[PDB]
Design a protein around this ligand. Sequence first.
Ligand SMILES: Cc1cc2nc3c(=O)[nH]c(=O)nc-3n(C[C@H](O)[C@H](O)[C@H](O)COP(=O)(O)OP(=O)(O)OC[C@H]3O[C@@H](n4cnc5c(N)ncnc54)[C@H](O)[C@@H]3O)c2cc1C
Ligand SMILES: Cc1cc2nc3c(=O)[nH]c(=O)nc-3n(C[C@H](O)[C@H](O)[C@H](O)COP(=O)(O)OP(=O)(O)OC[C@H]3O[C@@H](n4cnc5c(N)ncnc54)[C@H](O)[C@@H]3O)c2cc1C
Ligand SMILES: CC(=O)N1C[C@H]2CC[C@@H]1c1ccccc12
Ligand SMILES: [Br-]
Ligand SMILES: [Br-]
Ligand SMILES: [Br-]
Ligand SMILES: [Br-]
Lengths: 487, 489
Amino acid sequence: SKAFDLVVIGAGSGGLEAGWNAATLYGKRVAVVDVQTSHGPPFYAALGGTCVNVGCVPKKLMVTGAQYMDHLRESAGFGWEFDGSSVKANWKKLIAAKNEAVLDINKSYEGMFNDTEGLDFFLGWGSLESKNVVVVRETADPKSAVKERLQADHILLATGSWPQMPAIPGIEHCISSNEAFYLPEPPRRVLTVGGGFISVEFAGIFNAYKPPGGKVTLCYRNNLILRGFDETIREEVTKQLTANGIEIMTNENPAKVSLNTDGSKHVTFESGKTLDVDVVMMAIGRIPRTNDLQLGNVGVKLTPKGGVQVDEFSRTNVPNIYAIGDITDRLMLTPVAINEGAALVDTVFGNKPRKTDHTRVASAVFSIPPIGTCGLIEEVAAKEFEKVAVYMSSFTPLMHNISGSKYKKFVAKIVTNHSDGTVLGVHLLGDGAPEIIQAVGVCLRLNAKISDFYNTIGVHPTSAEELCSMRTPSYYYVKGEKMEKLP
Amino acid sequence: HMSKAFDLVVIGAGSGGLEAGWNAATLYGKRVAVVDVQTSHGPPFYAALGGTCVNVGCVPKKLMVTGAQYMDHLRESAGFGWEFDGSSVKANWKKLIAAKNEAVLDINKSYEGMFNDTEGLDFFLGWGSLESKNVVVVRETADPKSAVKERLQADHILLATGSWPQMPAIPGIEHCISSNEAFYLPEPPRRVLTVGGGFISVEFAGIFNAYKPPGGKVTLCYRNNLILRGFDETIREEVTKQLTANGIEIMTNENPAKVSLNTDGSKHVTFESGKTLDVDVVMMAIGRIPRTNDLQLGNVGVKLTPKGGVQVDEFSRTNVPNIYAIGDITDRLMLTPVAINEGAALVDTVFGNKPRKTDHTRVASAVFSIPPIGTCGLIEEVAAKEFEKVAVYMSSFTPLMHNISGSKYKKFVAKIVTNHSDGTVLGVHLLGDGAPEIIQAVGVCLRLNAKISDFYNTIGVHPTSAEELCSMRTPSYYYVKGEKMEKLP
Ligand SMILES: Cc1cc2nc3c(=O)[nH]c(=O)nc-3n(C[C@H](O)[C@H](O)[C@H](O)COP(=O)(O)OP(=O)(O)OC[C@H]3O[C@@H](n4cnc5c(N)ncnc54)[C@H](O)[C@@H]3O)c2cc1C
Ligand SMILES: Cc1cc2nc3c(=O)[nH]c(=O)nc-3n(C[C@H](O)[C@H](O)[C@H](O)COP(=O)(O)OP(=O)(O)OC[C@H]3O[C@@H](n4cnc5c(N)ncnc54)[C@H](O)[C@@H]3O)c2cc1C
Ligand SMILES: CC(=O)N1C[C@H]2CC[C@@H]1c1ccccc12
Ligand SMILES: [Br-]
Ligand SMILES: [Br-]
Ligand SMILES: [Br-]
Ligand SMILES: [Br-]
């Protein structure tokens, strides 16, 4: 048995921020538990978390790789010549480079633990034995061999989320993003199921690395992908994915999957349509990872949707037990989990309570081309405010008239409270959008108005200067109803 | 044939002059004439309708830097698994130049159509000069003895003629070119010397480095010790290293003394030190000077500064009440968006009874070097002279993607400079892919008097380079009454 100020279950984005801050900033005794010391099968996530191992970090490297399909074609308009028939995309090389980068990160976290006073790592599966006891077992089975018993003044639940798999016949013949990161070969025909960012990002990755004759299809059960993003941008990215050879099947949903004699999969949709593919990747959602924690031993309350219930300071209903990150089933982003972890420790072990602000969080989609966004979309703003103005700019940049990718319209939209000019949301589609949006997140914390943007001098030539060139609304929402002019 | 009369006559149909003229005619109903010397880009006069940025400046050079970036993309693609016949790769400069020419000409034509269409906004072709306080003469050439095409009566006159490359008076200067000619070279030079340490020399060095034929070499020389004076010093040193790493030779503390022709017609450069260099093109990029000579300002007594620009007050007014000047002719910040801002502010003040002056502080700007620079506000050594305590927050590392691409020399640098007494951000300085796009919204932040805590409190977008700006909480070092030190005393 061992005694600690804080025990953290999950060595992920939020859990490591909390543990490192508690130990080094406040001199507390910290233990952190995770199920694997490095990335990949069998548990996929590991020391460092989902983002490091099977999330933001590797997917961004793979999207960067897929972008070269466009760069090689687009170079020709600027005078670059080479033998186009010799081009091939080596997926095995991509995966190996990615594996080496992730493993390097795994190892550096290992040395962080070895080098930091009061910060200890334990390998295994953590669960709640009692209000102040965390048990670590050999496997997820609550009857496997006990490896450690950790006495804890404070306990932090930070186990993340896991892919949601629908209850359809043949679901066992589908994969999730976890397995996609380790496919031995790039699939020639693949169906990505879902309208969210993971489905869209992997569609672009597979589209660039598919062997000759390949085809990527994305299906989504409703009418328009990327629910929760700006509607203009949802429509445009649909158009631009289609322009690069991806087939978008909206209003379609798999009803069953069966095995073909050649090893491929036969998908039947609810509509009766059918599609044969080599890989079916389900990306329909991620759900809080609560089942192995034995929350019933202590009575931690869950919400109806399955998250651990928390107040604004990450406190559960059980004193001294906290939860942060995807397990709270709110904003599933790595920088939000980190922010929550730091606020938690500042509150518990320092003399200044802090709560994370979940509004005006900038985020991105690394689609090809990508999205950057911060704040409210117009239809959400129109329910909170009597008068909303939308400023819009949408055009193909000069360089893509030369590159030949004339479909690559850049979209920039600013949403305001028209009563006082306050910027409520900014939404971008196009090369650079994730980088452009970061400092917009800072602007929204300075009560920036549309006139603050338009009165700033532009940097020229950039896509970003469009944000400082919009003076006149394109249209409005009054009492919730869209209209081109004010009454 | 009779003279024509206007509320406003603009000499120079460039970045500032077109903003002023369009706004005066379309926002305030005034009658406007605009004068320029050429209706589309290129020789003989290079700049033309649209101005220096459109014709031989920001717009074409950015297209050409984008073309040059593909040399890096093609090489870097192999780390991510892309395979192709490297021996087959060729950079066709003629196709680049033709694509750029068609793009610029399309802009020329659209501006020509704006004038043909817009009530109260007229274009006159020729050389404008001041005859009297209310008369602009348009002549066939810059020579004031050349024939008169029009006389334009004007209640208000706007001088917006821009600037021009400076050429040093050395023997053999006739064998050298400027950026104007660089935009029209029939073939890419095998060996080229770019002379100068400023952004134009650096940007063109990158362009020539990508399009040079097999076995070529780009050399950049600068007469002082470190290129890119005025930019963050960490970034000055890093850009130097990363240009060197891509095969550009940087000769600092060197300056051409004379140029002669070898018997084969190549240029033989002798430096002041006695070193020699043989090249096919010498491009001078040592500075740009305001274009005042042809305006005949003595006719009306408009005062120039010692430096040579038109003297103006904060509202762009010369010493002659109804004559104004904006843009590069004022020899201050030579940027297109500053000239545009000055022109809009002038017209709002004169014709819109809503007075406004341009803020020349905290202006965001970029260098499209490879990799590029984005900056806004004060460099730390300047801040240390004005503030008792200055803090510097700094992050510099090779991003993960360039550990796979192989370009491990591509360190991304992010620096924030503050007044440590109250946290106010005084300047932000960036080096790396995306930096010009990242810095734009930073300019809005500084206009809003952002403090370092406003940056740190903002949640990052992950994974990006930009999120480094929102994860810096502890100074790397300080300046205390001018003195650099790791810790406060
Ligand atoms: C494909 C993909 C792409 C993404 N891309 C982005 C992106 O670009 N940007 C972004 O901001 N977010 C992205 N995310 C989301 C991001 O990964 C999560 O928001 C973040 O990782 C959650 O942090 P966390 O601290 O809640 O948990 P995690 O980082 O998930 O860590 C939880 C850890 O708990 C461990 N664990 C689980 N159960 C137990 C147990 N019983 N005992 C011990 N250890 C346990 C797990 O092994 C894991 O390491 C992406 C996610 C995915 C799946
Ligand atoms: C190579 C290069 C790259 C650049 N890159 C950038 C960049 O990336 N970003 C940026 O912000 N700035 C850049 N600049 C600077 C930018 O081009 C200038 O700051 C801007 O064009 C100045 O605008 P203006 O209105 O002062 O004059 P201009 O735009 O220069 O317009 C002046 C016009 O006056 C005309 N003219 C001159 N004399 C007469 C006369 N007597 N009668 C009639 N017409 C006349 C000229 O033909 C010209 O069209 C660059 C400049 C160069 C040279
Ligand atoms: C003024 C300018 O930019 N020039 C560039 C080059 C060609 C024309 C002119 C010039 C004069 C003297 C020597 C070399 C040159
Ligand atoms: Br779906
Ligand atoms: Br929908
Ligand atoms: Br060529
Ligand atoms: Br702070």
